[PDB]
């Protein structure tokens, strides 16, 4: 026993006094969205959707790691992760204020509503946006006063995204789709 102590006989043994519970599942989301918000108070969060080393655990049986884990006891198949966090949830709405410049999401996912935001002039040259033959964007300009000739809806929810349609369209510095709740349980003993 040389390296295993640094995980079992070190971290868990020095923090075998936790009674919090934050069970989350990354089914299909931008991983860093949940990761940075689990962090920010960095150094107290690490995903550990584990593996099957419980035969060895029972061989060395003297853990008593989480007695509050008796709820999904017939779920020995892709179990949730033994992650240790004891953070508060009354911090984001008072301590941190006026961020407003975070990074957008993957840029490409499906939006909830069909919205066309009005574009303001900036004084730049046209870029590499000569790929729109399929559906396109019929528009007309007349010194700022823009006029759309026909509307197009591209896709609904429940379908994967294209490849080269996220270059110079969303130039407002807005995250297109984070806006959701993904969590299995949030308890304290």
């Amino acid at each position: 026993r040389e390296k295993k102590a640094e995980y079992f006989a070190k971290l868990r043994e020095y923090l075998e006094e936790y009674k919090s519970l934050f069970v989350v599942g990354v089914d299909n989301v931008s991983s860093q969205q949940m990761h940075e918000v689990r962090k920010e108070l960095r150094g107290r969060a690490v995903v550990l959707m584990g593996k099957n080393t419980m035969v060895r655990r029972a061989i060395r049986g003297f853990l008593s790691d989480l007695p509050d884990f008796e709820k999904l006891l017939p779920f020995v198949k892709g179990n949730v992760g033994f992650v240790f966090t004891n953070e508060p949830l009354t911090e984001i709405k008072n301590v941190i204020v006026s961020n407003r410049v975070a990074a957008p999401a993957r840029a490409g996912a499906v939006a909830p509503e069909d919205i066309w935001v009005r574009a303001v002039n900036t004084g730049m040259e046209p870029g590499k946006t000569s790929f729109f033959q399929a559906l396109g964007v019929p528009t007309k300009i007349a010194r700022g006063t823009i006029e759309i000739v026909s509307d197009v809806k591209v896709v609904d929810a429940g379908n994967k995204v294209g490849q080269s349609e996220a270059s110079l369209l969303n130039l407002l510095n807005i995250s297109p789709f984070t806006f959701g709740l993904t969590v299995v349980q949030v308890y304290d003993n």
């Binding site: 399929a134 559906l135 809806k153 591209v154 896709v155 429940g158 379908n159 294209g162 490849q163």
Partner: protein, 191 residues
């Protein structure tokens, strides 16, 4: 090399039962009956005691022993189907041209019509075979469900439909409107 004797266990519950002729197999259970012909490789079956049928073969190569587990999969899957039922949920998706699907009986045939698929205007027909039924899924938008006892018939029908709803001469990754499976399960749950 030359595995002189290799076998595989297969279980059967008490409610159902099976009768094996020289080469034909016939399962019977609460949901119904089923039959199948095994004139393909000729491997032996041996009863033990009302619950355990051992499939067995003697002296063969890997090509000759692979058929053993293949027929094990065939028989245990089909008895699972006749004792538990199978179902396939497929979904519709459309970009701008919504689909129009319907079921139409004529001369005891029961075909299915598809319309407004990318703007076509003469019938896209497809037939259905026995032992399987379909109901348009209530309280949910743009789905269909096949349900039956066997698996080869229903899977072939679903594949036939999802292959018929194909398009050419358009962009190869922008157009993704058609029909495709989504869920594969049983008519019952955990039984």
């Amino acid at each position: 090399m030359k595995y002189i004797q290799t076998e595989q266990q297969i279980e059967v519950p008490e409610g159902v039962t099976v009768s094996i002729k020289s080469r034909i197999v016939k399962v019977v259970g609460p949901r119904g009956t089923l039959t199948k012909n095994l004139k393909h490789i000729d491997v032996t079956f041996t009863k033990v005691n009302n619950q355990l049928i051992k499939v067995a073969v003697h002296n063969g190569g890997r090509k000759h022993v692979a058929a053993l587990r293949t027929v094990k999969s065939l028989v245990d899957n089909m008895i699972t189907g006749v004792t538990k039922g199978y179902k396939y949920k497929m979904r519709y998706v459309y970009a701008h041209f919504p689909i129009n699907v319907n079921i139409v009986e004529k001369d005891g045939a029961k075909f299915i019509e598809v319309r407004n698929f990318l703007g076509d205007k003469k019938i896209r027909n497809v037939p259905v075979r026995d032992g399987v039924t379909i109901e348009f899924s209530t309280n949910v938008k743009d789905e269909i469900v096949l349900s039956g006892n066997s698996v080869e018939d229903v899977s072939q029908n679903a594949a036939d439909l999802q292959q018929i709803c194909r398009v050419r001469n358009k962009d190869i990754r922008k157009f993704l409107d058609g029909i495709y499976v989504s869920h594969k399960g049983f008519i019952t749950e955990d039984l």
